[PDB]
Amino acid sequence: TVLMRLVASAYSIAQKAGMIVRRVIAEGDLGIVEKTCATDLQTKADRLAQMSICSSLARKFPKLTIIGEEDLPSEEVDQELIEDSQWEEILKQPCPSQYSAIKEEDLVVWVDPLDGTKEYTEGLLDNVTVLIGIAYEGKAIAGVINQPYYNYEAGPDAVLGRTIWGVLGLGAFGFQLKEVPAGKHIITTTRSHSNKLVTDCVAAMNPDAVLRVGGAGNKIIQLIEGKASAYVFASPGCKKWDTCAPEVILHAVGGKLTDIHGNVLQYHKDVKHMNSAGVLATLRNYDYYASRVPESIKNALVP
Ligand SMILES: Nc1ncnc2c1ncn2[C@@H]1O[C@H](COP(=O)(O)O)[C@@H](O)[C@H]1O
Ligand SMILES: [Mg+2]
Ligand SMILES: [Mg+2]
Numbered sequence: 568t569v570l571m572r573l574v575a576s577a578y579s580i581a582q583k584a585g586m587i588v589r590r591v592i593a594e595g596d597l598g599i600v601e602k603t604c605a606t607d608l609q610t611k612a613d614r615l616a617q618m619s620i621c622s623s624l625a626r627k628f629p630k631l632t633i634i635g636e637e638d639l640p641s642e643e644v645d646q647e648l649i650e651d652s653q654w655e656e657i658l659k660q661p662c663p664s665q666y667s668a669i670k671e672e673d674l675v676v677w678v679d680p681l682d683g684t685k686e687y688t689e690g691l692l693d694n695v696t697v698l699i700g701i702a703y704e705g706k707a708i709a710g711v712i713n714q715p716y717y718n719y720e721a722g723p724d725a726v727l728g729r730t731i732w733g734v735l736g737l738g739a740f741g742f743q744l745k746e747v748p749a750g751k752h753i754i755t756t757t758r759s760h761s762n763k764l765v766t767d768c769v770a771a772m773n774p775d776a777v778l779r780v781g782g783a784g785n786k787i788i789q790l791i792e793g794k795a796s797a798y799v800f801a802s803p804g805c806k807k808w809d810t811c812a813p814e815v816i817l818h819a820v821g822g823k824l825t826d827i828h829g830n831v832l833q834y835h836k837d838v839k840h841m842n843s844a845g846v847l848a849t850l851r852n853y854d855y856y857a858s859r860v861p862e863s864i865k866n867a868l869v870p
């Protein structure tokens with residue numbers, strides 16, 4: 568099927584993006600550009616990874632809609648950046664029948680070529696993900712997440728980097744699902760984009776621990792691996808490419824991702840990019856957290 572060949576291609580493409588991300592650091596010049604402010608950055612890895620991802624997808628799927636974070640002038644793309652492979656192991660998995668007839672022109676791909684760029688520049692390398700989300704009829708249905716510096720500090724016997732993928736109806740793959748210890752409320756949130764509304768919303772959850780880490784992809788991986796019980800970000804700032812692939816993986820293991828009002832996010836081609844009402848995500852016990860978002864904070868954000 569189109570969908571599963573897409574997913575298999577996105578897996579190999581994400582890995583190539585992860586290689587580019589690691590090569591940029593290995594070579595030592597990040598080419599940092601400030602966009603709106605000093606915490607809103609774009610590096611040579613953001614730009615090269617996006618060129619790689621988008622070019623490689625468009626070559627294979629010429630009528631697909633592809634939407635990437637970075638606003639890059641249209642240039643020659645370096646042909647070494649093209650990834651032609653697709654991981655045959657994913658094509659061994661049966662496409663769910665509900666998706667088996669989808670045409671490429673009806674799919675929307677939401678790409679964050681490097682998520683956690685501020686942290687990447689600061690050396691918090693394992694916060695970084697590459698996000699490729701696939702949506703149909705406004706719903707996020709499949710996703711690939713590369714974590715190019717997974718195991719960066721695990722020592723010399725460990726595999727560096729990993730790729731996680733999922734398709735709703737088949738589940739999600741590439742990690743060990745774990746829950747936080749019972750009765751413990753561990754809230755994860757932004758490290759670099761905090762404000763009073765964000766920290767007040769965190770405080771309202773009566774946290775046992777608050778983690779401050781970069782990346783939307785990274786924080787969803789914290790939920791699925793039992794490092795945090797809730798991701799709580801009561802602020803605009805993140806966009807559909809930050810949430811599309813991560814929500815697929817979270818949904819695939821029974822979790823929930825919504826705005827702070829409890830609305831599901833939408834992923835149609837023409838949807839506004841901003842997640843203007845923030846993000847609330849959990850693996851389990853969603854209602855504990857949702858029921859504690861203060862009304863003042865809800866009223867401070869809209870769609
Ligand atoms: N105020 C902001 N400005 C720019 N990007 C943001 C902002 N808030 C969140 N993001 C993005 O949303 C994702 C998750 O945010 P964080 O938890 O701060 O890493 C990352 O891409 C951030 O760069
Ligand atoms: Mg950004
Ligand atoms: Mg990014």
Ligand SMILES: [Mg+2]
Pocket residue numbers: 679681682683783808809
């Ligand atoms: Mg991002």
